[PDB]
Amino acid sequence: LSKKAKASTVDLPIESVSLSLQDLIGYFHPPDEHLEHEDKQNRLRALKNRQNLFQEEGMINLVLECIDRLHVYSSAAHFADVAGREAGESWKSILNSLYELLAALIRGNRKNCAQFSGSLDWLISRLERLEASSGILEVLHCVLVESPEALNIIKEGHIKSIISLLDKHGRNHKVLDVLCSLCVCHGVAVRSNQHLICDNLLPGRDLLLQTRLVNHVSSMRPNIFLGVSEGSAQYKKWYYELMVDHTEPFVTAEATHLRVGWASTEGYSPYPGGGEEWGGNGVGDDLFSYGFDGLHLWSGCIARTVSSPNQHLLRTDDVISCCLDLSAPSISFRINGQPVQGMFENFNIDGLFFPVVSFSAGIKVRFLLGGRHGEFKFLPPPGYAPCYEAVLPKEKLKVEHSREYKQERTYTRDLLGPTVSLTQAAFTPIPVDT
Amino acid sequence: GVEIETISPGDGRTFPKKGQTCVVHYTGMLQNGKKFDSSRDRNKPFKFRIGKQEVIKGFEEGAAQMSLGQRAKLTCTPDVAYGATGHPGVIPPNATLIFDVELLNLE
Amino acid sequence: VDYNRAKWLKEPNPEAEELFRMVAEVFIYWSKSHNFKREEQNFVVQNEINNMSFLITDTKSKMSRKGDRYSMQTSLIVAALKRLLPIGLNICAPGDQELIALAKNRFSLKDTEDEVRDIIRSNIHLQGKLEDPAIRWQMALYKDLPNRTDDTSDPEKTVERVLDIANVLFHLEQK
Amino acid sequence: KKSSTLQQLISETMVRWAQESVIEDPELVRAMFVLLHRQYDGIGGLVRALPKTYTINGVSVEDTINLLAS
Amino acid sequence: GDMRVGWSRPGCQPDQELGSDERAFAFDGFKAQRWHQGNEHYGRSWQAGDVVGCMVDMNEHTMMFTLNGEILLDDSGSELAFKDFDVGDGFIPVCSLGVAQVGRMNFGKDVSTLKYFTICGLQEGYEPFAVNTNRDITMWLSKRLPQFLQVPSNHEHIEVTRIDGTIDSSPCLKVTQKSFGSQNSNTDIMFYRLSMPIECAEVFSKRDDYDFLMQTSTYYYSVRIFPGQEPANVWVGWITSDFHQYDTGFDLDRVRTVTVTLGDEKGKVHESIKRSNCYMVCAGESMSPGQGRNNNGLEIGCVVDAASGLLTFIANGKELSTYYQVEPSTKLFPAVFAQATSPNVFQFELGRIKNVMPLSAGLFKSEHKNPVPQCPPRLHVQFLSHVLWSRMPNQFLKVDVSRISERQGWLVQCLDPLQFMSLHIPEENRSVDILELTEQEELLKFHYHTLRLYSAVCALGNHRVAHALCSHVDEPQLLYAIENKYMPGLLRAGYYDLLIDIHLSSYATARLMMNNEYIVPMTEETKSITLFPDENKKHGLPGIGLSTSLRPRMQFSSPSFVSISNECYQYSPEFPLDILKSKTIQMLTEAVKEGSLHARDPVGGTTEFLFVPLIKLFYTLLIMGIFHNEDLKHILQLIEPSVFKEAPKEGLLQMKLPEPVKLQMCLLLQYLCDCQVRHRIEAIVAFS
């Protein structure tokens, strides 16, 4: 077929090769574990004798030659364009069967693996090809497990190729097993391989999953919903305060979380939107919340440092004044009465806003919402209104969990389905057309 | 060549001098936010002496120009942190390091 | 019984025990007699009684073709037996119900009264190892509150109750 | 009576396990029987230990520690 | 109201009605119906405050339901709600709640809390679902925020075909509509993205030319909208990992956005940053001048300059007016939002244009300087889906909220610390709780093998690699993994092994290797040793006593990464041994007490996962010799309270252990015998 002699004179025994490969795989199949011990030992002895006879007759090199001649082509369609449709339909299967036969030939045989250590370098050169990656990986695993000479042959380039296989083909645990075999074999460690794998896989922190301890973060909000619409009766400018009575900077090894600001719902639903409900995330960790932490303005899980007189992280005896102007969308902060040289603006105003504080363990804070719900320490800016004025006449102002589930006994925990939309929050009177 | 943001102000007068041992807590972070070191994780304050090349030099100037009791975020360029070689297995080549250093004590 | 069943469950009643004993013989005679089968079938078809109409009227206040005229499954006698079964279950306990269970299996393999009685009498002695939890913590947690007790039942009455509940259960699982 | 001794306790425990179940792990079987033989051959423990026993004076302790470290 | 309750198979979908398929058997009291693969009438309707007792008998394959104690009946006389179902993978309690519906599920951990169990079920030999459990059963509930997951090969509507890049073509990922032209076809919009993001430069610096192509940080990809698909229904661009907005009616004017304005002390706005999670354009408006709409497939090209964070678009060889400016370090996923109006919707084309690198160069660091476009198997097409579960945490923060006074406002206080271990997926830029790997299987397997690789790279005294690994798995993580009761068994074993290998294996091996050699200095302490503690020839507790035989010295180094001394790369990294010892003792006592009663929920899922890692850590510490005196007495009483009593509780020996646990107990007894032999040798030297 090669050398440009493509014609019907070709003598490819495609079906015969497929059948013979299946028969040989069955011939070299390892014994079942369910068998009796002595029968298993007899079958293992027969398998080892077959492997030794094949190796002495030089069948491994024949299999390698067949694999190489099949790999000169790049795809099933490319093979079929020269050999024919019937040969192309089984090119992939024949390659897989050849690799399986090689693995069965060398599996568990120290002598065969030691002899294959020489060709081990050629095997890895085609590890990246998708049609042969799994078979090459299995053969490599067998050889590395059985022969220390394979480990001695393995160098930095091969390890980097294996790590690149991780990088390109995704998360495959067989590659990790191969790396483990490279690190340790037969109770003897290879320091060079260990150092290479460490230095070439760990510092990237881009392939293996990363672990970390994260403080649980909860949120508190008043039962207030602020929204702006066309023809609505809701005031546009609002103001509230949060003052800190106590804050432990490090309750655990991770810094204490304390952010204050505003959050928006997802289109008139009372449930805060865009964020998870369990822990780890607070105000400003999504695009539905807008937070201040003393030094940074937080939004979309992104923090921008902001200047203020004697800027510092929120601590004891700190008063934060939050102002929300929905006329021209803006959110502003004032720390201890000093203005914060930063502002949120031009955010989505389709939805309901509410004051919110997010925190980890180790705080005492107090909402000041004006009136009989907390006297303001500072005079609110002109035009802005206290947050207690947004309470509906029937309801009573209350500070509660932003999410639905809190610490409680399991058999008393209330499971909640989807909640009705708070369409009555925005009072838009539409008279009958006359 | 390093620069410092305040987080919690210190006393503002007492600073490290030559021949003094700084006792600090720090939290080493990569520029993408991945933590690579933390003395608070080990629950053991880190002690290092000024001018003896005991630590990375950027951390050295940051701690030197911090004050007693102060907490600060230190940004260190690779040239003062680890350079192009990096730390094998921990720090990638040419990595800017962010530390959260609290200067607990001066001995 | 369906109306007042909870009250007898809360407070055991010798009258309920007598009623259960009563319907036990009714059920066993119902199972044994063969001509009675076609005889009840003929009586029901002559009356054209809906049978299920009584249960439909009961569950009507609570809103709760092939077998339109009559059905095997919804016999009135077996319905009464299954409604009174909770009384028997509350009178009995698993602690003798394990040997009552192999009493049913002996009945299935066709053991009659004499051998069933003597086998039960012989195998009551099989005690467990001195931890065995279900039995001891059930009965102990129940009766360590000392004042209330049901222990005034005689071994012969216990044997008779074992026998009759076993035969009722065996006939019920047969049909 | 009760075991009241580590050797008796181990001797009882190994036999009880072996006669309570057919152990499917050859490693477990070997460990159990090694332990039982050790319990019944307490003399052999000293026979093995004493040749590997050596005593030194107080002035060579540090040098012996360094040599053991190397 | 509209609520259902019953038993579901493990594979039950969270976004489908209970009983509307084969995966669940439910009772619906809103309409007094039974639900499995359809609807039938069964029972009556509850009112507010009712209690529905769900009953299953997997032996007889039966299901029953009771309302306030009374058994619900079928339309016929049958009490059984379901009669012939295969066991399959088993059944778990499940409930579904509609709009404004509130329910409570009680698994009967405290049987006294069950309202109608005694009335019906107690006498029928029905066990409460959580009767033999020590900890609360974890709860899983349908997720609210949709997430991007790979398109299944068995999807009803979406099919993805991977087309390899030839000499004259480019790699392509074609999205097709399976069910178009058949009814129940999804006319709803779908949100597709590529599995890997392009990350912008960390700091922004304010034929073709090979040098420019190598030095550039500009990447390109394209989307071909096929003829017959309306360009007004297709959006092309980039999204961030924050995008979760599944809306049937999508428009570019309603994407989440914000503007952070930073100014000086007195006005003087010095910067304004526009932030959003969706940087896309509509193909219909991108067309703009007059085209035939079908002469060739529309080719919208997206160009990202990461060195400057600039996003530009090309309609047909023509630059579009729409452009975006992203913040530094932004990770952007290629994304297409399409409402299918044809069996063939669109296709990603991962090629390149003049003077621009392909997308694979920026996606994969190994191809950072490879101009040839590539589509490795890691890159795939994901779609926004609602078929996901969320694990309700077993513990929440204890927050106390109270109105102090009218003047003082509302006090919110939280003092008790609480933490969870977060597993971060790097390519997807997302994080999960590591306890979700109980139900995520491929991630569980990969992370277990990652832990095995961590052990292997530091195995056999590789102190440098152990120090490096201390950066990736710190000791708070190790302690949390050791102590947590809800950890998967594989992860628990892996973390125990990782702790042992990083911090304890070297010295444990040194002591075990010097174990069978007795070098006894001749000192007064040695001379004071006697075979028996007192005149009564009673054996002392093994290990407890005075031993003077020479032992290897135990030394550890601090795993600091700011130092440059390098002299700490000898010795294993330091770990809190007192804390580890106390936790080991407490956990072993708890494990003995809990495994005595043979609970249904052992830590790790099996008794092996509960005991083998814990006993391995305990044995390692015992080999190291950290235990002393009272701790030795406590552990010996845990092993065997009767024999080791000092003058109904059963130790680990009389506990009906599995075979691996028996092997570890054999190791422990071997060490105790070795301690006795060492004491005998020291006494012999003292007498001699």
Coordinates of all heavy atoms in Angstrom, one line a residue, chain E residues 193-219:
Chain E
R193 N -20.7 26.7 26.0 CA -19.4 27.3 26.3 C -18.4 26.2 26.1 O -18.7 25.0 26.0 CB -19.3 27.9 27.7 CG -19.0 26.9 28.7 CD -18.5 27.6 30.0 NE -18.1 26.6 31.0 CZ -17.8 26.9 32.3 NH1 -17.9 28.1 32.7 NH2 -17.5 25.9 33.1
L194 N -17.1 26.7 25.9 CA -16.0 25.8 25.9 C -15.5 25.5 27.3 O -15.5 26.3 28.2 CB -14.9 26.3 25.0 CG -15.2 26.3 23.5 CD1 -13.9 26.6 22.7 CD2 -15.8 25.0 23.1
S195 N -14.9 24.3 27.5 CA -14.6 23.8 28.8 C -13.4 24.5 29.4 O -13.1 24.4 30.6 CB -14.3 22.3 28.8 OG -13.2 22.0 27.9
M196 N -12.6 25.3 28.6 CA -11.4 25.9 29.1 C -11.3 27.4 28.9 O -11.7 27.8 27.8 CB -10.1 25.2 28.6 CG -10.0 23.8 29.0 SD -8.6 23.0 28.2 CE -7.2 23.8 29.1
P197 N -10.8 28.2 29.8 CA -10.8 29.6 29.7 C -9.5 30.2 29.2 O -8.5 29.6 29.4 CB -11.1 30.1 31.1 CG -10.5 29.1 32.0 CD -10.4 27.8 31.2
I198 N -9.6 31.3 28.5 CA -8.4 32.1 28.2 C -8.2 33.1 29.4 O -9.1 33.9 29.7 CB -8.6 32.9 26.9 CG1 -8.5 31.9 25.7 CG2 -7.5 34.0 26.7 CD1 -7.1 31.5 25.3
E199 N -7.0 33.1 30.0 CA -6.7 34.0 31.1 C -5.9 35.2 30.6 O -4.9 35.1 30.0 CB -6.0 33.2 32.2 CG -5.9 34.0 33.5 CD -5.0 33.2 34.5 OE1 -4.8 32.0 34.3 OE2 -4.6 33.8 35.5
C200 N -6.4 36.4 31.0 CA -5.8 37.6 30.6 C -4.5 37.8 31.4 O -4.2 37.1 32.4 CB -6.7 38.8 30.8 SG -8.2 38.8 29.7
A201 N -3.7 38.7 30.9 CA -2.4 39.0 31.6 C -2.6 39.5 33.0 O -3.6 40.3 33.3 CB -1.6 40.0 30.8
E202 N -1.7 39.2 33.9 CA -1.9 39.6 35.3 C -1.7 41.1 35.4 O -2.5 41.7 36.2 CB -0.8 38.8 36.1 CG -1.2 38.8 37.6 CD -2.3 37.9 37.9 OE1 -2.2 36.7 37.5 OE2 -3.2 38.2 38.7
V203 N -0.8 41.7 34.7 CA -0.6 43.1 34.7 C -0.6 43.6 33.3 O 0.0 43.0 32.4 CB 0.8 43.5 35.4 CG1 0.8 45.0 35.5 CG2 0.9 42.8 36.7
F204 N -1.4 44.7 33.0 CA -1.6 45.2 31.7 C -0.5 46.3 31.5 O -0.3 47.2 32.2 CB -3.0 45.8 31.5 CG -4.0 44.8 31.3 CD1 -5.4 45.2 31.3 CD2 -3.7 43.5 31.2 CE1 -6.4 44.2 31.2 CE2 -4.7 42.5 31.0 CZ -6.0 42.9 31.0
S205 N 0.2 46.1 30.4 CA 1.3 47.0 30.0 C 0.7 48.1 29.0 O 0.3 47.7 27.9 CB 2.5 46.3 29.4 OG 2.1 45.7 28.1
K206 N 0.6 49.3 29.4 CA 0.1 50.4 28.6 C 1.1 50.8 27.5 O 2.1 50.2 27.3 CB -0.3 51.6 29.5 CG 0.9 52.3 30.2 CD 0.4 53.4 31.0 CE -0.4 53.0 32.2 NZ 0.5 52.3 33.2
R207 N 4.3 35.0 4.6 CA 2.9 35.2 5.1 C 3.0 36.2 6.3 O 3.3 37.4 6.2 CB 2.3 33.9 5.4 CG 2.1 33.0 4.2 CD 1.1 33.5 3.2 NE -0.2 33.5 3.8 CZ -1.2 34.2 3.2 NH1 -1.1 34.9 2.1 NH2 -2.4 34.2 3.8
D208 N 2.6 35.6 7.4 CA 2.7 36.4 8.7 C 4.1 36.5 9.2 O 5.0 35.8 8.7 CB 1.8 35.7 9.7 CG 2.1 34.3 10.0 OD1 2.9 33.7 9.2 OD2 1.5 33.7 10.9
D209 N 4.3 37.4 10.2 CA 5.6 37.6 10.8 C 5.7 36.6 12.0 O 4.9 36.6 12.9 CB 5.7 39.0 11.3 CG 7.1 39.5 11.2 OD1 8.1 38.7 11.2 OD2 7.3 40.8 11.0
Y210 N 6.7 35.7 11.9 CA 6.9 34.7 12.9 C 7.2 35.3 14.2 O 6.8 34.8 15.3 CB 7.9 33.7 12.4 CG 7.7 32.3 13.0 CD1 6.5 31.6 12.9 CD2 8.8 31.7 13.7 CE1 6.4 30.3 13.4 CE2 8.6 30.4 14.3 CZ 7.4 29.8 14.1 OH 7.2 28.5 14.6
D211 N 8.1 36.3 14.2 CA 8.5 36.9 15.5 C 7.3 37.6 16.2 O 7.1 37.5 17.4 CB 9.6 38.0 15.2 CG 10.9 37.3 14.7 OD1 11.2 36.2 15.1 OD2 11.6 38.0 14.0
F212 N 6.5 38.3 15.4 CA 5.3 38.9 16.0 C 4.3 37.8 16.5 O 3.7 38.0 17.6 CB 4.6 39.8 15.0 CG 3.3 40.4 15.5 CD1 3.3 41.5 16.4 CD2 2.1 39.8 15.1 CE1 2.1 42.0 16.8 CE2 0.9 40.4 15.6 CZ 0.9 41.4 16.4
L213 N 4.2 36.7 15.7 CA 3.3 35.7 16.1 C 3.7 35.0 17.4 O 2.9 34.6 18.3 CB 3.2 34.6 15.0 CG 2.0 33.6 15.0 CD1 0.7 34.3 14.9 CD2 2.2 32.6 14.0
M214 N 5.0 34.9 17.6 CA 5.5 34.4 18.9 C 5.4 35.3 20.0 O 5.1 35.0 21.2 CB 7.0 33.9 18.7 CG 7.1 32.7 17.8 SD 6.3 31.3 18.5 CE 5.9 30.4 17.0
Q215 N 5.7 36.6 19.8 CA 5.6 37.6 20.9 C 4.2 38.0 21.3 O 4.0 38.6 22.3 CB 6.4 38.8 20.5 CG 5.8 39.7 19.5 CD 5.0 40.9 20.1 OE1 5.4 41.6 21.0 NE2 3.8 41.0 19.5
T216 N 3.2 37.7 20.4 CA 1.9 38.3 20.6 C 1.2 37.5 21.7 O 1.4 36.3 22.0 CB 1.0 38.2 19.4 OG1 -0.2 38.9 19.6 CG2 0.8 36.8 18.9
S217 N 0.2 38.1 22.4 CA -0.7 37.5 23.4 C -2.1 37.7 22.9 O -3.0 37.9 23.7 CB -0.5 38.1 24.8 OG 0.8 37.8 25.3
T218 N -2.3 37.5 21.6 CA -3.6 37.7 21.0 C -4.1 36.3 20.5 O -3.3 35.6 19.7 CB -3.6 38.7 19.9 OG1 -3.0 39.9 20.4 CG2 -5.0 39.0 19.4
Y219 N -5.3 35.9 20.8 CA -5.8 34.6 20.4 C -7.2 34.8 19.7 O -7.8 35.8 19.9 CB -6.0 33.7 21.7 CG -4.8 33.6 22.5 CD1 -4.7 34.3 23.7 CD2 -3.7 32.9 22.1 CE1 -3.6 34.3 24.5 CE2 -2.5 32.9 22.9 CZ -2.5 33.5 24.1 OH -1.4 33.5 24.9

